[model samples]
Structure formats: C-alpha cells, structure tokens
Target chain A: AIPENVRIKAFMEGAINNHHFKCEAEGEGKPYEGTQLERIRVTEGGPLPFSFDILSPHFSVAITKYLSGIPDYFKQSFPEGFSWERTTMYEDGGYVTAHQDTSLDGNCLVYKIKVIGSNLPANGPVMQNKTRGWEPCTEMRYVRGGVLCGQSLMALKCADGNHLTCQLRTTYRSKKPAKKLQMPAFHFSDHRPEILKVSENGNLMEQYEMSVGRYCESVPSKLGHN
Target chain B: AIPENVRIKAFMEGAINNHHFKCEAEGEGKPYEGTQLERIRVTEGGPLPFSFDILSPHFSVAITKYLSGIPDYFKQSFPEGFSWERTTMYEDGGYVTAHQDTSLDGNCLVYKIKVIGSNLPANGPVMQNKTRGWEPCTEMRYVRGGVLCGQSLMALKCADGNHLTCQLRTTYRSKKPAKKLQMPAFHFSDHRPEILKVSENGNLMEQYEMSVGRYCESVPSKLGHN
Candidate 1:
C-alpha cells in the first residue's frame, strides 16, 4: 500500500486517482542548480526564461554524489515469488534536488506540472516536525486538485518553514510543484520548448537528471499483475 | 475521498506515503514525439541515447492541442472561501502523454525516475474496460513500489490490452515510470548528462513543454494550508 503521515485520499470527491501527501523532512542545504523555466507571475505572459549554472563543486560531485550513492531497498510489497535477479531489468535515475523551499507553495507537477491559477508566496516554508523523515508537519500546506487528478509531485515541510524534502520528486529516491510539491516550472504538457538547448535549432531543452540510483525496468507480472 | 477502480494503500509496512492506482483509460494513439533519453535494456551501460523528432503533425499541434483544451474544473474540496478569481493567480502545465503501453510492469520514476534492475518486455499493452473512462481494467499490469517511495507514473490496461491512461502522470492534467509510468528514461535523480543538450557541453538539453493549459502556481495558503 502506502505510508502514513502523508494522507492519501481520493483525488477528488469522485475521481479515479488516489492522491495524498503532507509528510515532513529536513530542509538544510543550499539550493541545487538545474535548468528551470518560469514566469514568476502569470499575469505576465511571454516566453519563460530558461537557464542553468554550476557553482562551487561541479554538480556531479557536490550535491548528489552522497545521496545517489546511498543504498535503497524496494519496500512496496510485490508478488510472492518475484525475484528481480531472475527476470532481467533496466536502469535510470530520479529528479534529485535539495530545495530550501518546503515545497508546499502549490502548483502541481514538477518536470510535468501545470500550476493552477492561485496566488500565495513564491516559495514559502512548509512547517513540519523538527524530527522524523515522513511524518505529518505541524502546519500542512494546502493542496488543491486542479485539472482532473492534480499534482504528481509535492513535499513535506519540517521544523523550519525553509526546509523541504522532495516527494519521489527524488523516486524510491524521488518530488515536483503541482501542490505541496512547490517550486518553479518544469517540462509539462506544454511540450513547447520555451528555452531550446543550444544544440537544438529549437526542439531540445535540457533536462536535469533526476535519480541518484538506477531502478528496475519491468513488466506488469513483476508486481503480480492479473 | 477517492474512486474505487484504483487501489491505494501504505507505501510500506511502515512508510509515510500513500501510493495507490491501476485505474483504466483508453489508449489508442501513435507514440507522441519528444526528446527521449533511454537505455531500453539495462545490461548495456554507457551514456543514454537522447534525440527528438517530428513526424507528421508537429508536437505543438498534433499531440496535445485537444487534450489541453479540455475544460477542467477544480474538484478537490478546499476551505470555505477559496475563490480562485478573488485571490489572483499564477499558472503552469502537466506531463501529458497517451501511450499504447498499459503502464504497469516496473521501473519506478519517470521524469525523475531511476529504474531499478529488472526487465520484462518493453512497452507492453495494458488491458482495460472498453466502456468506462476510469474503471478498473480486466487485466491490470503489475505495480510494485521500487524506492522508499517508488515510480510516480503508471497507467491502467483495457479490454484489448493495448491502451493506457496515465495517473495524475497527466496531473489534474499529468503521469512516469520507476513502475506504471512506462517509458524510456527521462531526467531523473542522476543529474548526470548522459546526452547533454546541444547547449549543454554541457548542461542545457531542450525540454518539451508538458501541459496544454496554464495551471495555477500557488503558495501554501491558496489551498488553505494551516
């Protein structure tokens, strides 16, 4: 199933998705750098800005090395006799980042989000229990389900409002900005290349590698699909 | 709070995330074109292949127009007086796709995913009900949570087993892989540039816009955060 702290309920009073969240985690790190596209204020409409920069340690070494290097275990219950070793698999990464932003400023989705039309602060602190990795915070950010289901990413605030812990925004290591997953714009339904990659005459817009580790690429039976 | 077609529960025996799903939807469309970086089969290792192409209707016009233009409403209940019009607002998009693949199988993350080490078939068909828009399919793909959290994207199968409907993977408009959100690799935790954007020696790889409409980029308060 899922864990607690973060409340999971129907995406809407009568929707098909089971959406939940508002867990807490520590937020004590300098903001990591990556490609971003945003229009801080929606009232203004034009082309969104896109850019990237590396400060101090090269991104490969500084921010993600330690985190990505950590060993992870697949906790979700699977079929009784599902051995990953037997059935070959593939690998990939997660959307890894350490934002001072507690993540609950609203907007849904991260890499593929479409913020609803509401106004709060840009990056407000999501207050949570000083202790605990995935417990509910004292103050939970308000999450509204826009569109059909709602944000695919969000985070839990912690003791201090400034800190944030991404949802699988990091994967078994994962987080985004639709609801509690606060932050700026990422590639969503638009598919429009606001900022093209220098390589791209226009099509390619660079993406930030997300995960620290590679996971298993599988078929339905792996998890005991019917 | 949620619909019954898809199931939701604990991420782990003692975890804090509420993960659920396996709802169904129709999936009959040519794979949309966009920037993709995938290893397909994991045994092979090296930089991933990154590329983008336009076949027939341009991505801007062909894939998302109609879906994006769909009139959506806020179904998630909010505080007593949450009139989006009154409080001004911001906006954004969602990760939109219509894959023929059923979406189960494995691999946890999508945009920010790190596929674990398992393999089955690549892009299998998901069986679902031909009638209902959001009903449980007769043949559901197996879903296994891979990470502390797990793949955020996934889809349900249908009667023919060749259709898919993303999770909030489409967000009020959103969907990923790490399990259900099946696809090749996307920007995830790795942050390492396997296929750098022409701009990125580098850093910037052009990104495809996700959603069709402008969602609200809100702060914690808008959703009635406490």
Candidate 2:
C-alpha cells in the first residue's frame, strides 16, 4: 500500500497537472468571461500552463490507479456497471449549469474533482513551471435510479511536505412532484448556486450543448469519453 | 473484472436474502415496518435485505489492482474523495433527501450502481431457495463545489425473466439549472417526461434522510475496541 501522505501529494499534483483547470463563474445564467490565458488545459508533455495531454486518459489512469491503491477510511463509491471519464471544462464562457449526467444507460452517479489550494504565488503570474506547490480537492455527486443519493461532497487538501485534510459535505437531491429533482446545499463556493435541473426528455441545457457541434461530436470519440 | 450481469445478480440476491435488514433510524424509523419480520435493528450486519455493503478499501484495492486500474474519469469526477459502505435506500419509504456529503474538508460527489432490470418472483414468499438473474444500469450525477447537481428520475422494468414486473423510480441532481440540463433520449428503452423543476432550493417530503453517523462509525477500528 502507498503511504497516505504520498498518495495525497500525488492526488494534489495530479489534479493540478492532469486536467484543464477553470475558475467558477461569477454571474447567473451566464458563463464567466476572463482572459483566455487564465484558463487552459494542463497535461503531461504539452505547453507548460495548461495542456490536454496530462489531463488525457494516459495520465489520469495512472493517478486513479495509484489513488485506488491508497489505504483510507473511505473508498471509491460507485457502481461497477459504468466506466469513468475525466475532462476539464476550461473555456471562459464554458460553464456547466445545474444538471445531472444520469442520462447514460447504467450510469447511476456522476462526480467532479475540483482541485483547489494551489500555492501558485498570488503575487506573480500563475506560472505552472515556477509554482512552489499545490493542493487538490475533489467533489463527488451521487445519482441513483435517476435520482441522486444524498448527493455527497468531499474534499482532500494537501501542500508540499504537509499533512492532508479530507472533508466531506452532506448534500442531496429530493424528488419533486411531476418527475422533478431538487438539490440543496449548506454552503456555496466556486460560484455554485443551489438546485440544478436534470431531465431525460429535452428540458434542460447540458455542458455538451455549449461546445461547438464538432467538439461535442468529437468528445465521445475522444479517449476519456464519460 | 466481474461481469456487470453477475454483479447485479449478486446485489439482487443479497437484497432478497437479507430482507431482515436493519434501519439506522431510531424509534422514529424501522428498517421495514410492514414486513412480516418481527425484529429490526435500524442497523445490522450484511446479507441483510434492502441493505448492502460496498466495502471501501477492498473495492478500491480491487479496482485499482485490476488491469488499467482506476481511470481518470473516476478521479476527476470524484476529487473530494471516495469510500466504501453498504448503501440501502431502495425499500418502500427508503428514501434519502437531497443533501451533499460535504463533511470532507473539500467538497465531494456521490455515485451509485443501479442493479435494476431483473424482476424477482413477487408471487411467492420472496424466493428463498434459487438464484435470480439481472441486467444492470449505470447513472452519473455531477455535483460541483459541494452543491446540488441536477436531478434525474429512473423507471425500471423486467426486460426478460421468469418473474413479475415491478416499477422503480429514481431522481438525480444536476450541476446546472434544470432548464440547462435537458436533452433528448438516445436509447430505445429511454423514456422522457415533461419539464421537471426549473427552480432552485425546494424541499421534499416522504423521503428517508440517511444517517451519515452510521457510516462514520461503522468502519472496523484498527485498535480492537472489544
């Protein structure tokens, strides 16, 4: 078994270096806009700031393989019928509205790993190559039968040569009248508001909708299709 | 890796065999009120019906130890953290309200494995002798920043088996608002409904609120308490 501290450090670094990182949106019903450079993909063997290679399946698989090996109080909680995919939404206008990914056949739950606590020196430009250290945080959502199960949320934090902190949030979705589902939260961060909508029939917007038709079509074919 | 069909069969058999499962509720809630069983321990051991355990460390290690190991999809989707625990909220009134498990220092998302599809022989005293078959389904719910994802609903039926037909409904949480998460159905068995909820922050009733305390305390201690 891998040391807990090493696993934590790897998770944090993997999160920072593996996928595309984006800041939360600030406006309602509108995607947050910022300098394009602020948001870019991060990958292994690509441009320094943010590239897709590291976030690619090649790198992510390694990270999870290692994470799955770590010994901890909690373990990966999801059904085995479905597979997992990892991608970062890194567009300035690219923001995912409140929605659920329970549409896929046999997909019971959806999860999001948001890596925060990067000590990228706020004083200087957020340069990846010159960064001192970072901490990764992940958020997971549970969906069942179509409904989310206590929609759970947890976070793991770590810095260079420091202990890690894991905190889980208790949030969930309740069934509403007429096939509707509601999600409530205790606190809000990353510009996340309360209550997102999800439907099987065509009643809500999804992340795939915002992407160009080409991008959307290409997404599934990509290595890390969810 | 275990075939999904086999896994579902195990889950179904497990649920039926353990009919006398306990509820984590105090006097206010019993595992199953109307059932013929005489006693119920709001909390009990495995092989218990309506309740199942997904051993965390064991499962994570198994998946990680398998070929290709854990994937990036799972890591990015469940960054806050993961765990293994027996989850049972599928009985009549076995409902969990919309709540996120953000107990972690960061936020977390929950995942579920819908072992639905195969129907049991409801005609007889819950099949105690033979084994039944099943078809599994997967669903995903993405909760961002420890907040509600979108909500989803699921309707299950007996596709082809030697048993009766039963209906099961499930809802999911979305990351974006309901309006933004709607989409067209892609599968032949997929069903759609009218506009679900487009609003945010709504309360629900007739739902069973899960007790996180049970999970927190259930893990076997390293130091033999006994």
Candidate 3:
C-alpha cells in the first residue's frame, strides 16, 4: 500500500551528506588513516572522484559508509583539497557507479564514506541485511525524473570496487547549494618556479609554461572526437 | 671601452640568480611577511607571477630584491603552492616588467623577490648607483637574439612598480634546463565537492564540474582573436 507516484528512481542528483572509509591497512588489520569528504555532489552514471591518503600499508582510517537519494551517482572525483584548522584536505581516491535504497524518494539522506571503503566486493552484493534480503544497496537508485544532471564520482578510485556501505541519515527534495568557501585558485602539487639561477652565463634563462598535446590544425579544437 | 657588438640591448633572458624585497608593513613598517621564489623562469615583455604571504598588514619577512641578465621581463603569475616540511607555499602577490644592468649579457643570475616588492614608484627610474649613474635597474636586459621565449613575470604584482633592486650573481649562454621534480597535476584553489547531502527531499543532489567558457559553434575554435 505504498504510493507509486512518490516512488522514484536513483537516477537523479545527490549531494553527499556524510561519508566513511572502511579500508584497513592490508595485513595489519589496522583502520585506514584518511579524511572523509564532508560535502560533495554526485551524478548518476558519471565518474567518481574520491581521494584517499594511504598513511601506510597498514593504518586505521576505516568505514566507507553511505545514505540515500533518488539521484544518479555519476562520476567520481579526487576534488581540490583545502587548508583548514591546520591541515590540507584531500578527499577521495576513487569512485564507482553506486545505487541503493535507504529510504523513499523526494528526500535527502546523510552517510559517511571512506576511500576504498566503497569497493564492491568481488564475490558479493553491495548490501545484505535481514529486512529486504539481498537488496540493491549500491546500485543507482531511480526517480520519476527522466532528466539527470550534476557532477558524478570522479577520483583515483573510479570504475569499481566495493568497501562502501551506508545508513540513511537526513534529507529534503528541494535543497540549497553548499556555501561558498574562502579559497585561492587552481594549483598543482608539483609546482615549479618561474625563474632559475644558474652559474654565470646561460642562454635560455627562462622556461615558459607549455602544455603537451597537438597544436597544429585541428587538434586543439577537438575534445572527445573518438 | 664601449664595444657596440658586445654592448647589446637589455632584451635578452637571464635566469634569476638572486632576489630581495625591501617592503615594510604598511604602517607598522615591519618587513612584509612572505616567502621568496626559487628557480623560476621569466620572459621579457611577458608575465611575472610572484606570490606572497601577507602574514598580516605588519609582519616580519620583507625584501623585494632583484638580480639580472638579458631578457624582456614579460608577464607575472601567482604560481602553484606546495605542501612541504609542513607548509604550503604561495609564491607571489604580483609582478612588473623590469630591466636593469646587473652584469654582461649571455649569462644567468640568482635573486630573491617579494610581492609588491617590484612596484615602480609612480615617479622614478629602475635603479640608482654611484658607478653607472641612475642606471636601468629592471628595464628588461637584452641580448643579440631576436626571439623572446619562455614564461614571463605573471603574478599578482604585474604592470609596474619599483621596490625591486638587484646585485649581479651568476650565468652562462648555454645552460642545461632545471631538473624535473616530483609533483602532481594542476588543481583549482576553489575545488568543490561533486556530491551533496541535502535535506530529506532535495532536487539537485550533485553538482557537475563546469567551466565558465564559450562552447558554442564557433567560439570554441578560436584563441588570441583580438
């Protein structure tokens, strides 16, 4: 006796409420040591950008958790890290197209996730419990909306794996965007100086910034041509 | 004494051999707080990207210094910062096209500089000395080469300024390039998460990465259109 009109698909957009990491240091059985992404956006059938700081082969940062929504968990991304409190934040190491049902549609939910915590086990379903049997835990949930949008999961751990799980948290059908943070600009981890000091005499003293790729004719103008 | 062929123009390139900044806190007059850039490339008539750390309006670290060679000091840049020894480095606040006679041409040099350290006083030349008169301190040294390549001074302090000065150091006409370092790819300072955890019933749970750019029929095919 459920309302069919309210029942929705998981092929929609979802902002990650909470995340967890269940990865353990390989053989030591210690939890992973990494930070979970507090807030993020996920699209259905897209890339997931998750970043994980593997402190060591055996560490203690664990618990790849999740929540609920009727959005398409698209891409995975290892988003831009920031300086807070006193540490640089690097969230996610990978991603996967995950779909599950923690609650009904037209509602948001909160959950925690960890890098490698969302890995889909090689020989098992996403989630299994006593209530719904082997229910669709990490599969893309569905909604009535035919159109899907938003950024997906895009990180070092895209493609597939399943160490991820989630317990439904909070929500709403109409949500406001995340607040803007005070940040600088784009940066590279391997940044180089724009100047150099050699011995006494050198010809090319300056090195200009250069991008690698084809430049002549039409190469620069075409992106997903294949 | 003045050999025409040997006495080339101040348009050649020279690797920064040395640098310094004499900036004082706006009112406190303390040394401007910041870090010096090491081993960067500068182009004549290009860009200068210098970064600075304004610990506060009145802080300790100060010294917008300079050094020389023969290259058009081009644009400026606010370079990529890195996490090292427990600190993130933001290189420059700005830049300026400067030229000066440090030594002979066909040579590299070493120097240190700070942001706003190179502001050309609203009224003044580049340098002043007892030997060469009020000589050109940073008017872009020159050589016989007709080509101007490499990245220029493209930083926060670009355009013009004069807190900068220099002392001749090292160099060579034919020098090897700087060694490659261990680094990551380009990253945006304002990196947002790809997912969101809205209220129970939110519409857009995910935010896709989108660049503010023209992707229409013809706009995507042109650069340097002006």
**Interface RMSD values, listed in order for every candidate:** 17.8, 18.8, 24.4
Instruction: Give lDDT tens digits, candidate 2, residues B108-148.
Output: 11222222212333443123322122111112222333322
lDDT of 2 at A30: 11
Each candidate's DockQ score against the native complex? 0.01, 0.02, 0.01
A108-159 per-residue lDDT for model 1 (tens digits): 2111111111111223221111311221111111112321121122222233
**Where does candidate 1 chain B have its weakest 10-residue lDDT segment?**
B81-90
Query: Candidate 3, which segments miss by more than 4 Å at Cα?
Result: A1-17, A25-86, A90-226, B1-104, B107-226
Query: Which stretches of candidate 2 lie above 4 Å from their native place?
Result: A1-156, A170-226, B1-226
- Arranged by DockQ with the best first, the candidates are 2, 1, 3
- Total clashing residue pairs per candidate? 139, 109, 239
The true-structure Cα RMSD of candidate 3 reads 25.5
Off by over 4 Å in 1: A1-117, A121-151, A156-215, A218-226, B1-128, B131-153, B160-226
Candidates, ranked, TM-score:
2, 1, 3
In angstroms, give how far residue B21 of model 1 lies from its true place.
20
